[PDB]
């Protein structure tokens, strides 16, 4: 990029001086430093096609107007140039309305997606019969029935063709006076369109990372938000992806309190904790409400770059930027009730700023409670996938060295991760174990092309709450009491009765 | 060859420098590192003659303008000189138009390829009768009836003689005032011409290799494409060839999506899996759409030379060259549905380039699912044929020693392939077996000159999909869980219950 | 389980599942089995010795019976190293 090409278009052999501009620092291509924002823009320039965005100016230039502009601005503010953002514009299915004016006898044609269908009209026919014939032909064609859907319009003499693949462009044409063609298309997206985009637009070859639909969550109603959350859960937990989703509460005008937020989170379900709920909307510098997902994702990527991937997106040393307040002040009691329900709160802590004060998922399984564990597992899975993509399509010869080599590749791949520090153990023998040799390979599965690998990992944990127990000794009773108390505490912790008993209120 | 003959034309003794020019790596005669492209050029320089092509410049010079130029360029770009290309130019049969301008009485002659048929014209005769008599004579002549075919022209007084052997030149002449002769020849080849070239031009002696017809598959309609695929199947599956064919889809405008591709590949049939269907067209550096078969064949030969012949033409390693994008983006669900049916997709994998992500054939047989298996079988067959070519026409005395010699030769020939790594087995006893001695020869077949010999082989296999099964272990209890699970898994595998059960959907 | 996760998949990709209890097989040796004679209202296997994979399988096949606690204790104390 810049700062190196200044002298290329110089002919004379002298020495010259230029001024250092901002240098674009390359973002690494490691699994989990990407965010995918699903949004809408009237100019569907890249619809159902993830496109990388370099800055808010680029976003505005490409997609013009969109309710996701504030979210993109927050994401870039909080990421500070780290991590990548990919925008996915939702495609509105095309629609074509065909009106059958009269039942004139003759030969006509209806062409859909370049496939032409003849229509012979005999005397005594009706426009309703002609519409029925058109619908039957389109819905019976083996290709058109898959590509589009033909239905009855507002009248018996009207046919509606709806594109069933919004990603691809649908073309229509007619030959015949009695047919009247109109190009209709909703000017706004629907929850069904969002669901299709989520479920059919992402490629496992893409970089893993966070997925956010702040526009959809802010605009849609309860059931539509539930549908979007279900789609995101299925996507992230799909065996292909193993990604993470950051769910935002609905508009605060509806979800005006932490109890409503808790009800929404309770309705939301994520067995493996792939979805994480964040509630307080952020009031940006222009006094505009924004869902917190974009800011959370940007801060998460910055945290991954700075303090490593084992750290969750929370804490007082990574306050959000581009905001000046929250849209609702979460009380300590409300948080004490909500955090165990998986509702991660955002607090306008004084002397620190706006800080995320929760790192929990929406899972009931105690082993995946924190989002850090989910992110660690996702990183492991994606690293292994991108490693093994090199070994896919390799010959399993008579040596069968392949399977053994693949098991040894895992060993080294997971060691690289252990050195990164994603596991709980002083040594790799405490951190992870692998099993992928020929001893666990079935000849029939090998003939089919299937190879099985088994991995065990121990993710690291975090510090959620810290207890301080204090005692006031007498004048000159230091270590005349300390030692006594200590011995008892150490003995209880070693024997195993420290935890056993009842938990104080 | 260049870099060695620089000094041949010098007389004065001395040391002379000539700037090391481009080099050539002699492509060895292995029975598969060749590709045969069937195309068309306006100037039939080598009508129905497989002619080797040194490079794109040589192709352009010999054949001039042709729709196969892009395919040839991509083939060479992706082959990097490790593999030969043989172009076969489709000959258009010559047609001769005869018109009986009048029914004037007199004896006249019509000469076709040196055979003169004489027709007597008498009073009361008509041009219709004259043409009918000429047609009858030509079609009943024992030589002309198989050399050419005569048909009625645009009028009852018009006749058209079409060559039945395009390779052999057809010469026509007439002696008679009523007879007027003109030379018709379609400037564009027909599906019948392509079929004849496929089914009557190739040679078993020609080194085994891939067969492609990108121009035909891109410029023909559905029925013609199906007919050409049938001809390719017959050629590659014929007992004298045993080759492999690569099929491209129709032009993207017709085959606009993977559903249409599945449909096309379903209409296509290949019992023994000699044919491999590919779909996404490659956009070359000039933004021209090109069938992928040429690039796929080039990459296949390159990968055969680098990683050996047991590997399939796919994988992130060995990505395609001379291209910058695909004509259509295949979704993961589309591929998940199409790959089982035999559609090998091509994907613009970011961070890897354009990669073929499929190695299946069109066969329904589970044994020959993979093009790698098909290629291994073809290589074995063709190597054995080349080896036995020397033993052909040898005598057979009472010693019957030639039979033992053939068996020993087969053993060494298969040992060479086993060293190459084409079989699944740690030893030859696990890889292959032979039976060709006198114990299976029959005196009647020996008198007829027929010798039978039987081969058993175990072709290698590939890694088509890798499964990662991971468990999230709690802190500290990693080793016990690993021991328990590993014991269970190994016990199940060794007992044979690892596969029995109900497969998850 | 753990081996058939990929049979019903078409795409050639690397992708992950989560490990499950892979019951370990019991070899055919004398004294690896317990035969429990009980009664169930549903005579599904009247006087027919039938193997039991686990307590849920027993409950599904035979429904309510007074031997449920015995079955549960047997499986708890056998830990999969035995047939019932």
């Amino acid at each position: 990029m810049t700062n190196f090409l200044n002298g290329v278009n110089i002919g004379t052999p002298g020495a010259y001086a230029f001024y250092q501009t901002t240098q674009s620092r390359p973002i690494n291509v490691e699994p989990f430093r990407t965010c995918y924002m699903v949004g809408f823009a009237s100019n569907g320039v890249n619809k159902n096609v993830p496109t990388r965005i370099s800055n808010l100016t680029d976003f505005t230039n490409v997609y013009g107007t969109s309710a996701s502009t504030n979210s993109v601005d927050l994401f870039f503010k909080n990421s500070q140039g780290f991590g990548n953002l990919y925008f996915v514009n939702v495609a509105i299915p095309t629609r074509y309305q065909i009106v059958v004016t009269a039942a004139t006898a003759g030969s006509y044609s209806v062409t859909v997606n370049g496939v032409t269908k003849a229509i012979t009209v005999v005397g005594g026919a009706t426009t309703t019969t002609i519409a029925a014939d058109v619908i039957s032909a389109i819905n019976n064609d083996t290709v058109l029935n898959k590509e589009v859907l033909a239905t009855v319009g507002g009248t018996s003499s009207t046919v509606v063709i709806t594109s069933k693949k919004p990603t691809n462009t649908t073309t229509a044409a007619v030959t015949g006076v009695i047919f009247t063609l109109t190009t209709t298309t909703g000017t706004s997206p629907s929850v069904a369109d969002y669901v299709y985009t989520i479920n059919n637009t992402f490629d496992p070859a893409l970089e893993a990372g966070f997925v956010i639909a702040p526009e959809a969550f802010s605009t849609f109603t309860k059931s539509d938000r539930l549908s979007i959350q279900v789609a995101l859960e299925n996507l992230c937990s799909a065996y292909r992806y193993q990604w993470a989703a950051l769910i935002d509460s609905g508009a605060m005008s509806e979800i005006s309190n932490t109890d409503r937020a808790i009800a929404e989170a309770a309705t939301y379900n994520s067995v493996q904790g792939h979805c994480s709920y964040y509630y307080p909307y952020l009031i940006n510098l222009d006094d505009q409400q924004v869902p917190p997902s974009a800011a959370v994702a940007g801060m998460a990527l910055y945290r991954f770059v700075i303090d490593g991937f084992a750290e969750p997106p929370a804490g007082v040393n990574f306050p959000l930027k581009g905001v000046k307040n929250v849209a609702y002040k979460v009380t300590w009691e409300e948080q004490n009730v909500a955090n165990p329900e998986g509702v991660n709160c955002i607090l306008n802590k004084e002397n620190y700023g706006i800080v995320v004060w929760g790192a929990r998922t929406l899972s009931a399984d105690p082993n995946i409670v924190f989002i850090s564990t989910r992110i660690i597992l996702n990183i492991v899975i994606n690293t292994l996938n991108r490693g093994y993509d090199f070994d896919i399509f390799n010959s399993v010869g008579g040596t069968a060295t392949v399977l053994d080599n693949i098991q040894r590749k895992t060993n080294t791949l997971l060691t690289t991760l252990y050195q990164a520090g994603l596991f709980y153990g002083q040594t790799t023998s405490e951190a992870f174990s692998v099993l992928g040799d020929a001893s666990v390979q079935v000849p029939s599965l090998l003939q089919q092309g299937l190879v099985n690998m088994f991995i065990w990992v121990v993710p690291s944990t975090i510090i959620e709450r810290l207890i301080i127990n204090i005692k006031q000794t007498a004048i000159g009773d230091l270590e005349a009491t300390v030692a006594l108390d200590t011995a008892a505490l150490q003995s209880s912790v070693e024997e195993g009765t420290a935890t056993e008993g009842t938990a104080p209120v | 060859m260049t870099n060695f003959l620089n000094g041949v034309n010098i007389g004065t003794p001395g040391a002379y420098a000539f700037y090391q020019t481009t080099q050539s790596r002699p492509i060895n005669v292995e029975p598969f590192r060749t590709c045969y492209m069937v195309g068309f050029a306006s100037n039939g320089v080598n009508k129905n003659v497989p002619t080797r092509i040194s490079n794109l410049t040589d192709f352009t010079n010999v054949y001039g303008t042709s729709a196969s130029t892009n395919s040839v360029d991509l083939f060479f770009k992706n082959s990097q000189g490790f593999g030969n290309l043989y172009f076969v130019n489709v000959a258009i049969p010559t047609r001769y138009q005869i018109v009986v301008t009048a029914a004037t009485a007199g004896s006249y002659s019509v000469t076709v390829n040196g055979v003169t048929k004489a027709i007597t014209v008498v009073g009361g005769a008509t041009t219709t009768t004259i043409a009918a008599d000429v047609i009858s004579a030509i079609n009943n002549d024992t030589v002309l009836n198989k050399e050419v075919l005569a048909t009625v022209g645009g009028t009852s007084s018009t006749v058209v003689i079409t060559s039945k052997k395009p390779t052999n030149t057809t010469t026509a002449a007439v002696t008679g005032v009523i007879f007027t002769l003109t030379t018709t020849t379609g400037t564009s080849p027909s599906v019948a011409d392509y079929v004849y070239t496929i089914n009557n031009t190739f040679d078993p002696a020609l080194e085994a290799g891939f067969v492609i017809a990108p121009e035909a598959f891109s410029t023909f309609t559905k029925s013609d494409r199906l007919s050409i695929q049938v001809a390719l199947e017959n050629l590659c599956s014929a007992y004298r060839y045993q080759w492999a064919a690569l099929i491209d889809s129709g032009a993207m405008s017709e085959i606009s999506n993977t559903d249409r591709a599945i449909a096309e590949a379903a209409t296509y049939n290949s019992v023994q899996g000699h044919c491999s269907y590919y779909y996404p067209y490659l956009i070359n550096l000039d933004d021209q759409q090109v069938p992928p078969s040429a690039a796929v064949a080039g990459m296949a030969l390159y990968r055969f030379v680098i990683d050996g012949f047991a590997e399939p033409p796919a994988g992130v390693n060995f990505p395609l060259k001379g291209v910058k994008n695909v004509a259509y983006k295949v979704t993961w669900e589309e591929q998940n549905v199409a790959n089982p049916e035999g559609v090998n997709c091509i994907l613009n994998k970011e961070n890897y380039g354009i990669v073929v992500w499929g190695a299946r054939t069109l066969s329904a047989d589970p044994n020959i699912v993979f093009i790698s298996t098909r290629i291994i079988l073809n290589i074995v067959i063709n190597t054995l044929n080349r080896g036995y070519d020397f033993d052909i026409f040898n005598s057979v005395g009472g010693t019957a020693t030639v039979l033992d010699n053939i068996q020993r030769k087969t053993n060494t020939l298969l040992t060479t392939l086993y060293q190459a790594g084409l079989f699944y087995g740690q030893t030859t006893s696990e890889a292959f077996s032979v039976l060709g001695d006198a114990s299976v020869q029959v005196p009647s077949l020996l008198q007829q000159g027929l010798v039978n010999m039987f081969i058993w082989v175990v072709p290698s296999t590939i890694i088509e999909r890798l499964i990662i099964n991971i468990k999230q272990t709690a802190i500290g209890d990693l080793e016990a869980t690993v021991a328990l699970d590993t014991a269970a898994l190994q016990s199940s595998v060794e007992e044979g219950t690892a596969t029995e059960g109900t497969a998850p959907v | 389980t753990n081996f058939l996760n990929g049979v019903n998949i078409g795409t050639p990709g690397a992708y992950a599942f989560y490990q499950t209890t892979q019951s370990r097989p019991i070899n055919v040796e004398p004294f690896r089995t317990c035969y429990m004679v009980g009664f169930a209202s549903n005579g599904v296997n009247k006087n027919v010795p039938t193997r039991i994979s686990n307590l849920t399988d027993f409950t599904n096949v035979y429904g309510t019976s007074a031997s449920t606690n015995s079955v549960d204790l047997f499986f708890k104390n056998s830990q999969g190293f035995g047939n019932l």
Binding site: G398, T399 | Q419, Q426, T427 | -
Partner: protein
């Protein structure tokens, strides 16, 4: 699965360059070729395990031997004079090859021990009027580098960049 037989101990041909002289005489015996790393022991403080820190690469001495025959006087003179010139160096050329007799099929480039200095020249290993062994001219060299060149295998390449 023995695709190709390994190199035997007799499967190498050894030649020398001595300064500007291209000596045309083959050596029948040579010692081991290596790249040794001198080591260092350290710890960071979290464990009582000792680790090894490679350093100070060294290419140990190479001892060549051959039958002491006529025409060896010029080789002796070149060897004993080369060290006199600070610019002169000794280069050793080892071509691996498969030979059944005088016939050989070389494969790959040749290992080149570059910038070697003479540490010992022993034209006569011993004298014994009753002995029957062949006199062995020995020569000890101290290589400073190793590379490969003149073939399509490149046995010894370096981590240059």
């Amino acid at each position: 699965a023995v695709s190709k037989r390994p190199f035997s101990i007799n499967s190498f041909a050894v030649n020398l360059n001595i300064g500007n002289f291209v000596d045309a005489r083959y050596w029948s015996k040579c010692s081991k070729i290596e790249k040794t790393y001198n080591t260092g022991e350290y710890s960071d403080g979290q464990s009582n395990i000792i680790y090894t820190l490679p350093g100070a690469i060294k290419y140990p001495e190479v001892v060549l031997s051959k039958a002491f025959s006529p025409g060896d006087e010029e080789l002796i003179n070149r060897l004993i004079a080369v060290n006199s010139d600070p610019i002169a160096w000794v280069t050793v050329f080892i071509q691996p090859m498969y030979r059944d007799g005088y016939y050989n099929v070389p494969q790959g480039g040749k290992i080149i021990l570059e910038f070697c200095t003479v540490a010992r020249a022993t034209p006569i290993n011993e004298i014994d009027t009753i002995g029957s062994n062949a006199a062995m001219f020995e020569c000890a060299l101290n290589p400073s580098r190793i590379r490969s060149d003149g073939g399509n295998i490149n046995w010894w390449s370096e981590p240059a960049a």
